[PDB]
Amino acid sequence: AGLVAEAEAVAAGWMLDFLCLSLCRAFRDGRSEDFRRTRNSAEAIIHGLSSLTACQLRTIYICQFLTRIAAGKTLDAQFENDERITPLESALMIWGSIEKEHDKLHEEIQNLIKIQAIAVCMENGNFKEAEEVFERIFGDPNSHMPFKSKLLMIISQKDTFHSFFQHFSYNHMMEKIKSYVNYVLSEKSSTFLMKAAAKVVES
Amino acid sequence: VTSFLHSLIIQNEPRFAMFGPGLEELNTSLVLSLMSSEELCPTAGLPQRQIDGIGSGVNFQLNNQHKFNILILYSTPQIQKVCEVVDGFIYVANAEAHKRHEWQDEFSHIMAMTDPAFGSSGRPLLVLSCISQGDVKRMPCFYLAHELHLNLLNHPWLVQDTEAETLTGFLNGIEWILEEVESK
């Protein structure tokens, strides 16, 4: 009964949405160990999928984005086959792949990630790496993100230009990302597994 | 409907174009197993449905009450007429782990073949992630959708795991694209 293999796809679609929603909650509340366990469950479930749609792919991208942000300050961790990419540069690529739902907020989060990707290098004393990151993000004779001229100056004058990074800090990036996660929590809070699970708890 | 006493404009069964690296790089042939087997009733196509220099394809069915036609292509002027008459596309990918891809070309190949200049964009695209047989190491379907940037193409899509020897997954995939057809 190949219908079974099709019933496994449905149950799998449900588990995926449930793990995402649970990962988003651990991110918002600061539960590192819960985040790690839910991450390992999600990793395996993704490996076992037999089919895929654009909706499920977007849900996967959201989980990936959060794992990179959580390691934003861990400069030597590597997430991509190319060893030169830092965690924030990896988060930015993923964010470019998630189809926009809230144009304004999406563009704000994007500009803040581009800025911090360099700032975390500057504040640790890695002037050379910041220069490498800058070249990989803005390195292209064309007009994108208008902060290019400012950040180039900051890099030349090899010293943490706190003055600027203060008004577009790590904390300000984290606040905007957590406002996005709330919009995700509200939408997915109505998925099959979560809803059914609540009724049992209410009894 | 708009006509109670007159017959309607004829609707011929759904037709699909099928191409891809999976049609030659696999140790076991997918087309042979499709042909050389049943529950599916493969028959030669009718000469009337001929598409200059290409033919009339192969006919199949799910259960006597569900029929569709497929034009198999092992290369890439004439194909364009196919891209216009066909209702959907089927890309057969090589999902064997030991393989290394040139994700750039594959994307383009699909890109060309599926241009809205030859037809609507509501036409579904089915990607078959195929391997020779059940004991071969396979690359997960998520990785495939990601490396092929399927969203840039603008066509609704689906990736389904398939096995050339037993045809596992083939049915569930066909069944899906037959609905994006009744959605038209």
UniProtKB/Swiss-Prot annotation, chain A:
Effect ascribed to mutating S156A: Loss of phosphorylation; induction of mitotic entry and apoptosis and increased radiation hypersensitivity of ataxia-telangiectasia cells
Annotated GO biological process: cell division; meiotic telomere clustering; negative regulation of DNA replication; negative regulation of establishment of protein localization to telomere; negative regulation of establishment of protein-containing complex localization to telomere; negative regulation of establishment of RNA localization to telomere; negative regulation of telomere maintenance via semi-conservative replication; negative regulation of telomere maintenance via telomerase
Phenotype for S156 to D/E: Fails to induce apoptosis and decreases radiation hypersensitivity of ataxia-telangiectasia cells (phospho-mimicking mutants)
Outcome of mutating W14P: Abolishes telomere binding
Cellular component GO terms held in the UniProt record: chromosome, telomeric region; cytoplasm; fibrillar center; nuclear body; nuclear telomere cap complex; nucleolus; nucleoplasm; nucleus
Keyword Ubl conjugation included in the entry's annotation: yes
Listed result of changing L57R: Loss of interaction with FBXO4
Effect upon mutating F27P: Diminishes telomere binding
Phosphoserine modification, residue list: S156
Entry annotated with the keyword Cell division: yes
Subcellular locations according to the entry: Nucleus; Cytoplasm, Cytoskeleton, Spindle; Chromosome, Telomere
Keywords: Acetylation, ADP-ribosylation, Cell cycle, Cell division, Chromosome, Cytoplasm, Cytoskeleton, DNA-binding, Isopeptide bond, Mitosis, Nucleus, Phosphoprotein, Telomere, Ubl conjugation
GO molecular function, one term: microtubule binding
Protein induction: Expression is tightly regulated during the cell cycle; levels are low in G1 and S phase and increase during G2 phase and mitosis.
Covalent cross-link (Glycyl lysine isopeptide (Lys-Gly) (interchain with G-Cter in SUMO2)), residues: K150
Function text: Binds the telomeric double-stranded 5'-TTAGGG-3' repeat and negatively regulates telomere length. Involved in the regulation of the mitotic spindle. Component of the shelterin complex (telosome) that is involved in the regulation of telomere length and protection. Shelterin associates with arrays of double-stranded 5'-TTAGGG-3' repeats added by telomerase and protects chromosome ends; without its protective activity, telomeres are no longer hidden from the DNA damage surveillance and chromosome ends are inappropriately processed by DNA repair pathways.
Domain comment as written in the entry: The acidic N-terminal domain binds to the ankyrin repeats of TNKS1 and TNKS2. The C-terminal domain binds microtubules.
Name by which UniProt lists this protein: Telomeric repeat-binding factor 1
Natural source organism: Homo sapiens
Phylogenetic lineage: Eukaryota, Metazoa, Chordata, Craniata, Vertebrata
Gene it is expressed from: TERF1
Shown part of the complete sequence: 64 to 266 of 439
Swiss-Prot record, chain B:
Post-translational modification: It is low in resting cells and high in the S phase and the G2/M phase of the cell cycle. Phosphorylation is decreased during late G1 phase.
Cell location: Cytoplasm
Source domain of life: Eukaryota
Assembly notes: Homodimer. Part of the SCF (SKP1-CUL1-F-box) E3 ubiquitin-protein ligase complex SCF(FBXO4) formed of CUL1, SKP1, RBX1 and FBXO4. Interacts with TERF1; this interaction is prevented in the presence of GNL3L. Identified in a complex with CRYAB and CCND1.
Function: Substrate recognition component of a SCF (SKP1-CUL1-F-box protein) E3 ubiquitin-protein ligase complex that mediates the ubiquitination and subsequent proteasomal degradation of target proteins. Promotes ubiquitination of cyclin-D1 (CCND1) and its subsequent proteasomal degradation. However, it does not act as a major regulator of CCND1 stability during the G1/S transition. Recognizes TERF1 and promotes its ubiquitination together with UBE2D1. Promotes ubiquitination of FXR1 following phosphorylation of FXR1 by GSK3B, leading to FXR1 degradation by the proteasome.
UniProt name for this protein: F-box only protein 4
Organism: Homo sapiens
Portion of the parent chain present: 164 to 384 of 387
